[PDB]
Design a protein around this ligand. Structure first.
Ligand SMILES: [Zn+2]
Length: 144
């Protein structure tokens, strides 16, 4: 059974929620209520704090690509990701940026550890963009 389109739909749906949260903050900056900086910090505070289905999480990177906020591997924060490869050599962050720059959003598969461990395992993530800040927002499921 497969059965996996359903899980991908749920990831897609949670990432769309994260897109909503980000647009909501951006809109407030646009109307001049908070500075752009406050808006970005409020979005990151919510994304850093949120989990779903237990330990599933969101991260944010920019278009360089450079990490903005990663909640389970925070040592990546501010690091240049161009050239970051998983163990099969995949430039996965470059592929996120190409996908959103070319299609607006979409699924990208790659190898990445589960929270709390270090062995990269098969992952399928939905990534989306918030263009006014040059952000990519993502979340994925672990195939196994
Ligand atoms: Zn509101």
């Amino acid at each position: 059974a497969r059965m996996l389109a359903e899980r991908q739909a749920k990831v897609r749906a949670l990432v769309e929620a994260a897109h909503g949260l980000v647009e909501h903050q951006g809109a407030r900056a646009a109307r001049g209520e908070i500075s752009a900086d406050e808006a970005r910090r409020a979005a990151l505070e919510a994304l850093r704090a949120l989990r779903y289905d237990g330990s599933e999480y969101f991260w944010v990177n920019d278009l360089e690509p450079r990490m903005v906020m990663h909640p389970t591997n925070p040592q990546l924060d501010g690091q240049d990701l161009s050239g970051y490869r998983d163990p099969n050599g995949k430039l996965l962050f470059q592929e996120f940026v190409r996908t959103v720059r070319a299609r607006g959003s979409g699924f990208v598969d790659y190898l990445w550890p589960k929270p709390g461990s270090t062995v990269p395992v098969p992952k399928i993530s939905f990534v989306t963009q918030y263009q006014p800040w040059g952000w990519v927002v993502g979340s994925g499921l672990y195939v196994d």
